[PDB]
Paper text:
FCoV-23 is a recently emerged, highly pathogenic recombinant coronavirus responsible for a widespread outbreak of feline infectious peritonitis. All coronaviruses are decorated with several copies of a homotrimeric spike (S) glycoprotein that is the target of neutralizing antibodies, drives viral entry through receptor binding and membrane fusion and contributes to pathogenesis. FCoV-23 S-long comprises an amino-terminal S1 subunit, folding as five domains designated 0 and A–D, and a C-terminal S2 subunit. Collectively, these findings identify APN as a bona fide entry receptor for FCoV-23, which seems to have broad receptor species tropism, mirroring that of CCoV-HuPn-2018.
To reveal the 3D organization of the infection machinery of FCoV-23, we determined cryogenic electron microscopy (cryo-EM) structures of a prefusion-stabilized S glycoprotein ectodomain trimer construct comprising D0, which we designated ‘S-long’. 3D classification of the cryo-EM data revealed the presence of two distinct S protein conformations: one with a population of trimers with three D0 regions swung out, and the other with a population of trimers with two D0 regions swung out and one D0 region in a proximal conformation. Furthermore, the alphacoronavirus-specific S glycoprotein domain 0 (D0) mediates attachment to host cell-surface carbohydrates, which may facilitate the entry process. Although the FCoV-23 D0 and CCoV-HuPn-2018 D0 share only 27% amino acid sequence identity, their structures superimposed with a r.m.s.d. of 5.8 Å over 197 aligned Cα pairs (out of 246 residues), which underscores their structural similarity. However, structure-based sequence alignment of these two domains highlighted numerous diverging regions that could explain the distinct haemagglutination phenotypes mediated by the most divergent domain among these two S glycoproteins. CCoV-HuPn-2018 D0 NPs (positive control) haemagglutinated human, turkey and chicken erythrocytes, whereas we did not detect FCoV-23 S-mediated haemagglutination of any of the red blood cells tested.
Numbering used by the authors: 18 to 262
């Protein structure tokens, strides 16, 4: 789904520390009964992407023809207290409205930013966005004018064991955070592509690091879910005709 890029490598998302049950908990969010079911949808698979650059040059990655975007972070420092975040910005394109997700770094030392709220949603009608100004300015003057600015908290006490996600169609947007999902009714023409800024130089809101993995989902995926005596297992169906027959 990603454009070719020498900075981006493939990684098994489950084998990273704290990610043993990352995909398991997402699949069983809605299946609460006992027994078996085969579910289809825009679910994440095993192999994700880690994009990083040792030099402090601004770098971008592009995902095309995707319906969903998921990402995962490492555990924050001092997660139970004054948690210090790591930065990540991406932009879901559409007309006449597009969406920018920005997660800033550092802690309570960022001026004017509400306490323990590292996440920002900018709903904007701007056609061309200057990401350098967005990620280099003071937090109070970032997403202003006619844009809609929504601060939100990641859950630092989750320690990066839960998946973060976004799915969209032309009538509804769904956000996945912690073990919960939020719905947003909006009529829009999404372009089905995402721009991601994974590295730049340190600023008042950005810290040079590589702490995220991400995946864009474009194809319909099938999982077989089995709940036996409270033991929850899953299997990725390569073809639907095999696991169901
Ligand atoms: C992702 O992992 C696979 C397989 O990992 C194995 O199964 C996991 C559940 C866990 O137990 C791992 O420790 C296991 O190794 C990797 O594919 C393996 O690659 C090695 C080294 O080249 C090779 O000897 C094995 O035969 C491969 N196994 C299979 C089943 O093909 C794969 O490299 C990882 N993908 C990445 C890092 O992108
Ligand atoms: C780890 O963070 C704790 C907790 O920070 C406090 O709570 C946060 C949610 C936020 O509101 C911070 O501003 C708070 O300070 C730190 O412990 C606090 O340290 C301050 C230092 O001025 C002190 O006044 C508080 O009493 C402490 N609160 C406690 C102990 O409950 C702690 O220092 C951090 N550890 C690091 C950064 O290593
Ligand atoms: C996230 O990690 C933190 C820090 O490792 C965990 O906080 C600890 O929780 C245990 C209970 O298992 C307490 O006894 C410790 O005192 C806590 N450590 C602190 C406050 O420094 C936290 O439980 C983890 N959250 C999860 C796993 O959801
Ligand atoms: C995301 O997709 C949209 C829609 O396909 C792309 O917008 C088109 O881009 C081409 C090439 O620059 C232009 O010629 C078209 O006029 C655009 N169509 C529009 C705006 O409706 C957009 O470029 C894609 N973005 C990325 C980063 O791939
Ligand atoms: C993504 O991969 C990079 C390397 O490509 C990882 O960062 C490296 O971490 C090791 C161990 O701390 C260091 O020796 C390297 O210098 C780091 N490289 C860079 C460019 O920072 C990074 O941890 C990976 N991200 C994950 C797993 O989330
Ligand atoms: C769901 O998983 C459970 C546990 O792995 C499976 O139940 C086991 O099935 C095997 C062979 O069918 C039996 O030998 C075991 O005794 C069963 N375990 C228990 C605790 O009953 C079950 O078959 C799986 N479900 C499906 C539909 O494949
Ligand atoms: C996604 O599905 C399309 C269906 O046309 C197929 O051509 C493509 O190879 C699939 N991609 C992956 C990564 O499975």
């Amino acid at each position: 789904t990603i454009k070719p890029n020498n900075d981006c490598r493939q990684v098994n998302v489950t084998q990273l520390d704290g990610n043993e049950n990352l995909i398991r908990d997402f699949l069983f969010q809605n299946f609460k009964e006992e027994g078996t079911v085969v579910v289809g949808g825009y679910y994440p698979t095993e192999v994700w992407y880690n994009c990083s650059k040792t030099l402090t040059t601004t770098a971008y990655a592009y995902f095309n023809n995707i319906h969903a975007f998921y990402f995962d972070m490492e555990a924050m420092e001092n997660s139970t207290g004054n948690a210090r975040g790591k930065p990540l910005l991406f932009h879901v394109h559409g007309e006449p409205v597009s969406v920018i997700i920005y997660i800033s770094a550092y802690g309570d030392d960022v001026q004017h930013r509400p306490l323990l709220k590292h996440g920002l949603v900018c709903i904007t009608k701007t056609r061309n966005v200057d990401y350098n100004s967005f990620t280099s300015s003071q937090w109070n003057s970032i997403c202003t004018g006619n844009d809609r600015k929504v601060p939100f908290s990641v859950i630092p006490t989750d320690n990066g064991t839960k998946i973060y996600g976004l799915e969209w169609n032309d009538e509804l947007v769904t956000a996945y955070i912690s073990g919960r999902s939020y719905n947003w009714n909006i009529n829009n023409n999404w372009f089905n592509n995402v721009t991601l800024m994974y590295s730049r130089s340190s600023t008042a809101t950005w810290l040079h690091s590589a702490a995220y993995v991400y995946q864009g989902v474009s194809n319909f995926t099938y999982y077989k879910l089995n709940n036996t005596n409270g033991l929850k297992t899953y299997e990725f169906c390569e073809d639907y005709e095999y696991c169901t027959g």
